[PDB]
RNA sequence: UUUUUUUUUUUUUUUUU
RNA sequence: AAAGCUAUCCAAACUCGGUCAUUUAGAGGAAGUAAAAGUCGUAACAAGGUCUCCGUUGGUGAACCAGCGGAGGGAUCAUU
RNA sequence: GGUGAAAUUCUUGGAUUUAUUGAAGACUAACUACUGCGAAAGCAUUUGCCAAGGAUGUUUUCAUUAAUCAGGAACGAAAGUUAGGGGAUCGAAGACGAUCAGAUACCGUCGUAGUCUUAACCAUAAACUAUGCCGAUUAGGGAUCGGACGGUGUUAUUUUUUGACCCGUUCGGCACCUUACGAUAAAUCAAAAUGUUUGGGCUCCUGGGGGAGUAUGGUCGCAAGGCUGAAACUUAAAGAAAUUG
RNA sequence: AGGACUUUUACCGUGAACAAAUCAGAUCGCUCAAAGAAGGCCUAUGCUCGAAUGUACUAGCAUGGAAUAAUAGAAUAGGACG
RNA sequence: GGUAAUUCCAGCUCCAAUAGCGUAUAUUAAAGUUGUUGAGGUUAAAAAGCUCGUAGUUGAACCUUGGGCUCGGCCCGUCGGU
RNA sequence: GUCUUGGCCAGCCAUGGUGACAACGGGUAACGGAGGGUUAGGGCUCGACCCCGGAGAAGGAGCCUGAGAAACGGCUACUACAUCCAAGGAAGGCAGCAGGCGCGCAAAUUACCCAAUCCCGACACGGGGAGGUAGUGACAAUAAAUACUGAUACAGGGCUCUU
RNA sequence: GCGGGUAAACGGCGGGAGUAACUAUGACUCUCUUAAGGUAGCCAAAUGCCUCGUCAUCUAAUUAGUGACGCGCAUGAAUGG
RNA sequence: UAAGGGAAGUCGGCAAAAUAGAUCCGUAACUUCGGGAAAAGGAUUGGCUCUAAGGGUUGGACAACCAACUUAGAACUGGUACGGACAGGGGGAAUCUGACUGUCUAAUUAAAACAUAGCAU
């Protein structure tokens, strides 16, 4: 039984990345997945991702540029306070200037660095570096 | 896989992307609903109705042709079965095993299957009571199964 | 000693223990 | 690893499972059951006093051939009988029948230490005088 | 240590297989685990084939062949030198010896 | 492919350009 | 208006049973552990000299033995 | 007869052997496979009946109805128990004959319970793939089983369909072969991989070796026993995989 | 300031309130230090700085945020609208 | 430690702390040997014989996005106005 | 009835209340907390004891006075313990400060004083074993003695030379 | 008469000597002997002479009672345990 | 019938005493799960004055005319007595033995003896 489609997408992405493949097929399609992909794309850790429309959950084909070390999800989505970002970043990321911890806040899917600017917090859902 | 077996076999029907009636159909939505009502009035189950329409009369998908699924058409026309298809076939199957188990007592394999058949009925009837298809006081009883099927 | 017959020896000793308790009871 | 629950509302299962599995920890089980207060020869205390009942010799475990000098001591506080090792060369002469001696732990946490089998306590003071003080030329045994 | 990938038999997916009796021990062993030899040899030894042909009357008679299926346990096959202990790498070779 | 039981305690190794 | 007195109420205490909890004596019986130059066998480790082990049953000074079913952790990854 | 060799044993009352027939009970050889079905335990002669099941195909239907599960329940080899039937073979216990220092064993001749069946219990196995269930992804390859599809040519039938064989594709299985981008302490593993770059979901179990799956209490059982399940005390190792002798 | 119309919970931000002592921590040459809350300046006449600051998890109170996680809504229309 | 004792009893010498040092017991770190972070379960201890199933835990995708008009604060540069 | 609400209690009526999200029962060598120890983060453990709250005054119960007590350096009764006696009677509560016995591995003087902090009284005036001072005190903590120095003789490391 | 079967047919079911690093006892060994040498159980029992057996409990005191022990004159398995 | 004691009497609690109905409470080991069990052990009981409940018939959650017992509640009352006579279990912890119900030595032995179901030949 599918329980975390976000984990399925990131696991498939990471498997293709470690194998050296330049692209990966992702099923199914979710609003969280697309927003999570766009966070990758803004920092350039991926390239083009294309969504195939269907009369069901869609598919995504992501073109990988090879500059992607590790992407993973967090289960459950712990409720994080503003004072807890630094502990979460330290215990989970490499050196604190490359990776980006992904949260879901009332402002939407967005980074841990962006949270410090906007002074908001929420639930941790993933990470990359 | 299967809910009551190892059974990891994938086999289904792939609905085409069209969502539009093909150009070779010249039948009116009024006509096909008349076909649906006539078949249901005779006694055909909504699963059986789709088969005969698809195989003989060329209706690939009733929803594509009309816009409503067969059961919602039947309820609108007041011809929906009192008992849902899913329970009726499951209860009828359980009744069949009982008559075999009464005669054959050493069939411990048939005894085990009856438990699985009964377990599906209880899980199913629990869902119908949740959505409101069946009364909350509806209960499947061993000796009363034959009465419901008749 | 084999564990199969260490188990048998203890199991025999347990049966004798229950008889001694029934005698007192 | 283990198939531990990972839901956000599974704290009850996580705490209950930890409480059950913590009993297998030997040191927590000893403290939680309070076995020192129940079964230990001492009442959980570091030391205890008793009356010397007799002097016994204990053969050393292999590979070691010697007679470790010990005394059977009946504790005053509860009446339990234990065997106490008498350390240092020739200190068994100071101890005598019906003396009042103070006993302590012998090594680590009630386990016998060294090649002395079944001895888990040692003599510290005799007649209110330290055994080392008697063994050295420092103090004198009470006149009595 | 697991000595063999197939344990000692061939019943993966079979659950339980009825046992058989060893040929020269009567040991009760499973049919797939047992070591089976199908032997086809002339009913008369090659040394005495000529004399049988001499007594042929009726001189076109072909001597029939005995058709035996010998089933052995592990202890009997090894002691009878039907099979031999092989090296760690040579144990995996599932090919009959060449002629 | 006749059979072949047992072996008193302890004791059996270290450093650098 | 004191002593006293009527009837409820609060109720110490004792006796008599019940129940729970915790200690403790006991003829005798049956175990465990430790200590070693004790007696008897040699069951296991090699095909340990009857391959070993598991469940069950019965028997024997003792390790153990045997019947039924199973496993290889086998002494066979294999016979066209 | 039987064995390494013998002996107990049967035998001129004809043993053993030969042929024919009958009775009894059990079992289903060769075909039989790195094959199949079943949740597992297990399941191998023919025929008929009864009910069930997976895979396949589907442009049929419902529309979240799902996954795993503390307690709870069904089934559960062999052995064992109760009451009948049956009782051929084999064979615990037992009696002998050998061997041996002894032989309450291995070996041989007998032989009771049992082995078979109906009704009712028992609920344990090295019940093992020592590898929990669901889901996604990840290197190649050839066999094989069931279904489906496309093509080709022989063969039997045929108002040209179907079966057998051939090639290929795909779904679902039992497995297997080489390799390590990986894992492990290693043996080895396409899972025991995607884990110090540590979070997909759920349940169960373990915390040095003994004492001990023991004592006690509870509960189930006709009993044998099953399930639950300690502590005192003792000990510096026990153990796993490989290496050289 | 009176009334009407707000889906409801979880979550995050902010704010109020939240004994001392303890802890972190600012200042002062108790001869240094542990400590203590002192002290310092003018010759005097008397003049003055201090005795800070942080800390209130979870529960409760007020407001904002509306992604994420849940729940309802019109189907025998017994639905909305003047 | 069994007649050459670097380990016992002593003499000498030296080492550590030093007005202190040793010992016994309790607890913490070490202990990723209690593991939520963060253990292990083929063979080292450990997947219930197997299936069904309640409480519990968890549970496919989907509903306002996109663009433009702007306005302001802060930060990163040269202009430095004194 | 109570200062007052209340199944707090007395009468009448109904059958409800809690529980697998652990009720009820048992253990605690359990007074609760602010906090102590030790930890990168997450934690583990202790908290009789200088402060806040609760309860008790040998073990229960009852009560007077009083704004305030179920008070105990108040009373009454019972149980245990215990004091004087002329044997008729009377009198008692150190878990307040010292001190003694016992218990234990385990813990100080039957000292001085209201001068300091505050409290009480009719009160500037008196009282306070609250409290302060001193004695015992290696609980723990801070600083810090047991020695400093010149030359002579010798040796080493250097320096100009190695006659 | 000879030969075989039959004990839920009647019935029966042994002695002596040596031996374990204190002593004691004898798991063990040797020998005579039987149709077989009393197995599981149980006991000074309504069955034990010696005997008021030895130990414990019951009492102030117990040849009584009860619980154990067991070379049991002379216990014991459908003469059923 | 007996003061105080309470089996010291006796081979031995023989004989006698004690308990005794009804209602409410409470009830152990053991067990063949059926019992033990009336286990053990407690409380109440009179009279008088009341109150309430439990029905039938005929006329449409009502009205009227009948009916005789049972149960429950409350005041008052008395030399605290009340199943006031009669009637009416003593109990518990064990050992030996026979499973149990049943039967016999008329006129000294009622038992462990006989029988029985069950088992076997
Ligand atoms: Mg699938
Ligand atoms: Mg399921
Ligand atoms: Mg269900
Ligand atoms: Mg969650
Ligand atoms: Mg050693
Ligand atoms: Mg099997
Ligand atoms: Mg040897
Ligand atoms: Mg020997
Ligand atoms: Mg030996
Ligand atoms: Mg072996
Ligand atoms: Mg091996
Ligand atoms: Mg003949
Ligand atoms: Mg087949
Ligand atoms: Mg056949
Ligand atoms: Mg079918
Ligand atoms: Mg098991
Ligand atoms: Mg297993
Ligand atoms: Mg998978
Ligand atoms: Mg295939
Ligand atoms: Mg095929
Ligand atoms: Mg298959
Ligand atoms: Mg541990
Ligand atoms: Mg352990
Ligand atoms: Mg090894
Ligand atoms: Mg570990
Ligand atoms: Mg092992
Ligand atoms: Mg293991
Ligand atoms: Mg399994
Ligand atoms: Mg849900
Ligand atoms: Mg206390
Ligand atoms: Mg205390
Ligand atoms: Mg009072
Ligand atoms: Mg005092
Ligand atoms: Mg007799
Ligand atoms: Mg007399
Ligand atoms: Mg008579
Ligand atoms: Mg008479
Ligand atoms: Mg009789």
Short mmCIF file of N, CA, C and O (backbone and C1' of nucleotides) in Angstrom, two decimals, chain D residues 1-4 7-10 14 18 21-22 24-25 31 44 46-47 64-65 104-110 122 135, chain J residues 1-2 8-10 22-28 31-41 47 55-59:
data_model
loop_
_atom_site.label_atom_id
_atom_site.label_comp_id
_atom_site.label_asym_id
_atom_site.label_seq_id
_atom_site.Cartn_x
_atom_site.Cartn_y
_atom_site.Cartn_z
N UNK D 1 18.15 -1.85 14.06
CA UNK D 1 17.00 -1.15 13.48
C UNK D 1 15.72 -1.52 14.21
O UNK D 1 15.37 -0.92 15.23
N UNK D 2 15.02 -2.52 13.68
CA UNK D 2 13.76 -2.95 14.24
C UNK D 2 12.57 -2.27 13.59
O UNK D 2 12.65 -1.17 13.05
N UNK D 3 11.43 -2.95 13.65
CA UNK D 3 10.20 -2.41 13.11
C UNK D 3 9.46 -1.53 14.09
O UNK D 3 8.26 -1.70 14.30
N UNK D 4 10.18 -0.59 14.69
CA UNK D 4 9.56 0.32 15.64
C UNK D 4 8.54 1.21 14.92
O UNK D 4 8.71 1.53 13.74
N UNK D 7 4.79 6.48 13.41
CA UNK D 7 3.72 7.44 13.29
C UNK D 7 3.98 8.66 14.15
O UNK D 7 4.83 8.67 15.03
N UNK D 8 3.22 9.72 13.88
CA UNK D 8 3.30 10.92 14.70
C UNK D 8 2.48 10.81 15.97
O UNK D 8 2.68 11.62 16.89
N UNK D 9 1.58 9.84 16.06
CA UNK D 9 0.73 9.64 17.23
C UNK D 9 0.97 8.27 17.85
O UNK D 9 0.05 7.60 18.31
N UNK D 10 2.23 7.83 17.86
CA UNK D 10 2.60 6.53 18.41
C UNK D 10 3.54 6.66 19.61
O UNK D 10 4.38 5.79 19.83
N UNK D 14 5.62 3.69 21.75
CA UNK D 14 7.06 3.82 21.92
C UNK D 14 7.45 3.80 23.39
O UNK D 14 8.47 3.20 23.76
N UNK D 18 9.44 0.64 25.26
CA UNK D 18 10.69 0.89 25.97
C UNK D 18 10.61 0.42 27.41
O UNK D 18 11.58 -0.12 27.95
N UNK D 21 10.95 -3.46 27.34
CA UNK D 21 12.27 -3.93 26.97
C UNK D 21 13.37 -3.47 27.92
O UNK D 21 14.46 -4.05 27.90
N UNK D 22 13.11 -2.46 28.73
CA UNK D 22 14.13 -2.00 29.66
C UNK D 22 14.35 -2.98 30.80
O UNK D 22 15.40 -2.92 31.46
N UNK D 24 14.97 -6.10 30.55
CA UNK D 24 16.07 -6.99 30.20
C UNK D 24 17.43 -6.39 30.53
O UNK D 24 18.40 -7.14 30.65
N UNK D 25 17.52 -5.08 30.67
CA UNK D 25 18.76 -4.45 31.11
C UNK D 25 19.05 -4.89 32.54
O UNK D 25 18.23 -4.70 33.44
N UNK D 31 18.02 -2.34 40.01
CA UNK D 31 17.58 -1.16 40.74
C UNK D 31 16.06 -1.09 40.84
O UNK D 31 15.52 -0.79 41.91
N UNK D 44 21.60 -3.06 51.64
CA UNK D 44 21.97 -2.05 50.68
C UNK D 44 23.05 -1.11 51.15
O UNK D 44 23.39 -0.16 50.42
N UNK D 46 26.96 0.09 52.50
CA UNK D 46 28.32 -0.17 52.07
C UNK D 46 29.02 -1.15 53.01
O UNK D 46 29.78 -2.01 52.56
N UNK D 47 28.77 -1.04 54.31
CA UNK D 47 29.43 -1.86 55.31
C UNK D 47 28.39 -2.51 56.22
O UNK D 47 27.20 -2.17 56.19
N UNK D 64 45.85 -21.71 40.53
CA UNK D 64 46.36 -21.09 41.75
C UNK D 64 46.23 -22.09 42.89
O UNK D 64 45.16 -22.67 43.08
N UNK D 65 47.30 -22.30 43.64
CA UNK D 65 47.29 -23.27 44.73
C UNK D 65 47.66 -22.53 46.02
O UNK D 65 48.83 -22.21 46.24
N UNK D 104 33.07 -5.06 54.44
CA UNK D 104 32.77 -4.20 53.31
C UNK D 104 32.64 -5.04 52.05
O UNK D 104 32.80 -6.26 52.06
N UNK D 105 32.33 -4.37 50.94
CA UNK D 105 32.34 -5.04 49.66
C UNK D 105 33.74 -5.49 49.29
O UNK D 105 34.74 -4.92 49.72
N UNK D 106 33.81 -6.54 48.49
CA UNK D 106 35.08 -7.16 48.12
C UNK D 106 35.17 -7.14 46.60
O UNK D 106 34.84 -8.12 45.93
N UNK D 107 35.63 -6.02 46.06
CA UNK D 107 35.75 -5.87 44.62
C UNK D 107 34.66 -5.03 43.99
O UNK D 107 34.57 -3.83 44.25
N UNK D 108 33.82 -5.65 43.16
CA UNK D 108 32.87 -4.93 42.32
C UNK D 108 31.47 -5.52 42.43
O UNK D 108 31.18 -6.56 41.82
N UNK D 109 30.62 -4.87 43.21
CA UNK D 109 29.17 -5.02 43.13
C UNK D 109 28.71 -6.43 43.50
O UNK D 109 27.86 -7.02 42.83
N UNK D 110 29.26 -6.97 44.58
CA UNK D 110 28.78 -8.23 45.11
C UNK D 110 29.27 -9.47 44.39
O UNK D 110 28.92 -10.58 44.80
N UNK D 122 34.98 -8.61 52.62
CA UNK D 122 36.29 -8.57 53.25
C UNK D 122 36.19 -7.89 54.61
O UNK D 122 35.29 -7.09 54.86
N UNK D 135 47.82 -4.65 61.27
CA UNK D 135 48.83 -5.35 60.49
C UNK D 135 50.16 -4.59 60.47
O UNK D 135 51.22 -5.21 60.57
P G J 1 55.87 -16.69 38.12
"O5'" G J 1 55.78 -16.96 39.69
"C5'" G J 1 56.75 -16.42 40.57
"C4'" G J 1 56.49 -16.79 42.01
"C3'" G J 1 56.50 -18.27 42.34
"O3'" G J 1 57.80 -18.81 42.43
"C1'" G J 1 54.69 -17.22 43.43
P G J 2 58.22 -20.05 41.49
"O5'" G J 2 57.47 -21.29 42.13
"C5'" G J 2 57.75 -21.71 43.47
"C4'" G J 2 58.08 -23.18 43.54
"C3'" G J 2 59.08 -23.68 42.50
"O3'" G J 2 59.92 -24.68 43.09
"C1'" G J 2 57.06 -24.88 42.29
P C J 8 54.51 -7.24 45.11
"O5'" C J 8 54.33 -8.49 46.07
"C5'" C J 8 53.04 -8.99 46.40
"C4'" C J 8 53.14 -10.06 47.45
"C3'" C J 8 53.95 -9.68 48.68
"O3'" C J 8 53.18 -9.00 49.65
"C1'" C J 8 54.71 -11.75 47.84
P C J 9 53.67 -7.60 50.26
"O5'" C J 9 54.75 -8.02 51.35
"C5'" C J 9 54.40 -8.88 52.42
"C4'" C J 9 55.62 -9.27 53.21
"C3'" C J 9 56.58 -8.14 53.53
"O3'" C J 9 56.18 -7.40 54.67
"C1'" C J 9 57.79 -9.96 52.65
P A J 10 56.29 -5.79 54.67
"O5'" A J 10 57.75 -5.52 55.22
"C5'" A J 10 58.63 -4.62 54.56
"C4'" A J 10 60.06 -5.07 54.67
"C3'" A J 10 61.11 -4.09 54.19
"O3'" A J 10 61.41 -3.09 55.15
"C1'" A J 10 61.56 -6.22 53.29
P G J 22 43.54 8.51 45.50
"O5'" G J 22 43.35 7.19 46.37
"C5'" G J 22 44.34 6.17 46.35
"C4'" G J 22 44.11 5.14 47.44
"C3'" G J 22 42.83 4.33 47.35
"O3'" G J 22 42.88 3.29 46.40
"C1'" G J 22 43.16 5.05 49.57
P U J 23 41.55 2.85 45.62
"O5'" U J 23 40.65 2.17 46.74
"C5'" U J 23 41.07 0.98 47.39
"C4'" U J 23 40.19 0.63 48.56
"C3'" U J 23 38.73 0.35 48.25
"O3'" U J 23 38.50 -0.94 47.73
"C1'" U J 23 38.87 1.77 50.12
P A J 24 37.35 -1.17 46.63
"O5'" A J 24 36.00 -1.08 47.46
"C5'" A J 24 35.60 -2.15 48.31
"C4'" A J 24 34.30 -1.85 49.02
"C3'" A J 24 33.14 -1.43 48.14
"O3'" A J 24 32.47 -2.52 47.54
"C1'" A J 24 33.30 0.03 49.99
P U J 25 31.70 -2.34 46.15
"O5'" U J 25 30.41 -1.49 46.53
"C5'" U J 25 29.33 -2.08 47.25
"C4'" U J 25 28.33 -1.04 47.68
"C3'" U J 25 27.65 -0.25 46.57
"O3'" U J 25 26.58 -0.95 45.96
"C1'" U J 25 28.40 1.23 48.23
P A J 26 26.18 -0.61 44.44
"O5'" A J 26 25.49 0.82 44.53
"C5'" A J 26 24.23 0.99 45.15
"C4'" A J 26 23.75 2.42 45.04
"C3'" A J 26 23.78 3.02 43.64
"O3'" A J 26 22.64 2.67 42.87
"C1'" A J 26 24.73 4.54 45.19
P U J 27 22.80 2.32 41.31
"O5'" U J 27 22.93 3.74 40.61
"C5'" U J 27 21.88 4.70 40.70
"C4'" U J 27 22.36 6.07 40.28
"C3'" U J 27 22.99 6.15 38.90
"O3'" U J 27 22.04 6.24 37.86
"C1'" U J 27 24.35 7.29 40.47
P U J 28 22.43 5.84 36.36
"O5'" U J 28 23.34 7.04 35.86
"C5'" U J 28 22.79 8.33 35.66
"C4'" U J 28 23.85 9.32 35.24
"C3'" U J 28 24.68 8.95 34.02
"O3'" U J 28 24.01 9.22 32.81
"C1'" U J 28 26.10 9.72 35.74
P A J 31 31.17 4.73 24.09
"O5'" A J 31 29.72 4.41 24.66
"C5'" A J 31 28.88 3.45 24.02
"C4'" A J 31 27.45 3.55 24.48
"C3'" A J 31 27.08 4.86 25.18
"O3'" A J 31 25.73 5.20 24.87
"C1'" A J 31 26.66 3.04 26.63
P G J 32 25.41 6.08 23.56
"O5'" G J 32 25.23 5.00 22.40
"C5'" G J 32 24.27 3.96 22.51
"C4'" G J 32 24.36 2.98 21.37
"C3'" G J 32 25.76 2.47 21.06
"O3'" G J 32 25.70 1.10 20.67
"C1'" G J 32 24.85 3.52 19.14
P U J 33 26.48 -0.01 21.53
"O5'" U J 33 25.70 -0.05 22.92
"C5'" U J 33 24.35 -0.49 22.99
"C4'" U J 33 24.08 -1.18 24.30
"C3'" U J 33 24.07 -0.30 25.53
"O3'" U J 33 22.82 0.34 25.72
"C1'" U J 33 25.36 -2.24 25.94
P U J 34 22.65 1.54 26.77
"O5'" U J 34 21.16 2.03 26.51
"C5'" U J 34 20.72 2.34 25.20
"C4'" U J 34 19.23 2.22 25.06
"C3'" U J 34 18.41 2.84 26.20
"O3'" U J 34 17.21 3.39 25.66
"C1'" U J 34 17.88 0.55 25.99
P G J 35 17.07 4.97 25.45
"O5'" G J 35 17.33 5.18 23.89
"C5'" G J 35 16.45 4.63 22.93
"C4'" G J 35 17.12 4.46 21.59
"C3'" G J 35 16.46 3.47 20.64
"O3'" G J 35 15.44 4.08 19.87
"C1'" G J 35 18.85 3.20 20.66
P U J 36 13.89 3.94 20.26
"O5'" U J 36 13.27 5.35 19.87
"C5'" U J 36 12.45 5.51 18.72
"C4'" U J 36 12.37 6.95 18.29
"C3'" U J 36 13.64 7.52 17.67
"O3'" U J 36 13.71 7.25 16.28
"C1'" U J 36 12.79 9.02 19.31
P U J 37 15.08 6.72 15.63
"O5'" U J 37 16.07 7.95 15.75
"C5'" U J 37 15.83 9.15 15.02
"C4'" U J 37 16.74 10.27 15.47
"C3'" U J 37 18.22 9.95 15.51
"O3'" U J 37 18.83 10.06 14.23
"C1'" U J 37 17.58 11.10 17.49
P G J 38 19.91 8.98 13.74
"O5'" G J 38 19.31 7.58 14.21
"C5'" G J 38 19.95 6.36 13.86
"C4'" G J 38 19.93 5.37 14.99
"C3'" G J 38 18.58 5.17 15.67
"O3'" G J 38 18.51 3.83 16.17
"C1'" G J 38 20.13 5.97 17.25
P A J 39 18.25 2.57 15.20
"O5'" A J 39 19.28 1.47 15.72
"C5'" A J 39 20.67 1.74 15.78
"C4'" A J 39 21.42 0.64 16.49
"C3'" A J 39 21.22 -0.77 15.94
"O3'" A J 39 22.05 -1.04 14.83
"C1'" A J 39 20.94 -0.79 18.28
P G J 40 21.48 -1.89 13.58
"O5'" G J 40 21.21 -3.34 14.19
"C5'" G J 40 22.29 -4.16 14.60
"C4'" G J 40 21.80 -5.42 15.28
"C3'" G J 40 20.84 -6.29 14.49
"O3'" G J 40 21.49 -7.11 13.53
"C1'" G J 40 20.04 -6.04 16.70
P G J 41 20.69 -7.61 12.23
"O5'" G J 41 19.65 -8.68 12.79
"C5'" G J 41 20.10 -9.90 13.35
"C4'" G J 41 18.95 -10.77 13.79
"C3'" G J 41 17.92 -11.09 12.73
"O3'" G J 41 18.32 -12.15 11.88
"C1'" G J 41 16.83 -10.45 14.73
P A J 47 13.20 -15.96 16.78
"O5'" A J 47 13.18 -14.88 15.61
"C5'" A J 47 12.93 -15.26 14.27
"C4'" A J 47 11.46 -15.14 13.93
"C3'" A J 47 11.09 -15.61 12.52
"O3'" A J 47 9.76 -16.14 12.55
"C1'" A J 47 10.51 -13.34 12.78
P A J 55 -11.47 -1.76 15.35
"O5'" A J 55 -10.69 -1.47 16.71
"C5'" A J 55 -11.40 -1.11 17.89
"C4'" A J 55 -10.48 -1.01 19.08
"C3'" A J 55 -9.33 -0.02 18.96
"O3'" A J 55 -9.71 1.32 19.19
"C1'" A J 55 -8.52 -2.07 19.81
P G J 56 -9.23 2.48 18.20
"O5'" G J 56 -7.64 2.40 18.23
"C5'" G J 56 -6.92 2.76 19.40
"C4'" G J 56 -5.46 2.39 19.27
"C3'" G J 56 -4.68 3.09 18.17
"O3'" G J 56 -4.25 4.38 18.55
"C1'" G J 56 -4.22 0.77 18.13
P U J 57 -4.19 5.57 17.48
"O5'" U J 57 -3.00 5.15 16.50
"C5'" U J 57 -1.66 5.13 16.96
"C4'" U J 57 -0.74 4.57 15.92
"C3'" U J 57 -0.84 5.20 14.54
"O3'" U J 57 -0.12 6.42 14.43
"C1'" U J 57 -0.86 2.86 14.32
P U J 58 -0.68 7.59 13.48
"O5'" U J 58 -0.57 6.97 12.01
"C5'" U J 58 0.69 6.81 11.40
"C4'" U J 58 0.60 6.02 10.11
"C3'" U J 58 -0.24 6.62 9.00
"O3'" U J 58 0.42 7.66 8.30
"C1'" U J 58 -0.71 4.31 9.18
P G J 59 -0.45 8.80 7.56
"O5'" G J 59 -1.25 8.02 6.43
"C5'" G J 59 -0.62 7.66 5.20
"C4'" G J 59 -1.41 6.63 4.43
"C3'" G J 59 -2.53 7.15 3.54
"O3'" G J 59 -2.06 7.67 2.31
"C1'" G J 59 -3.28 5.26 4.74
#
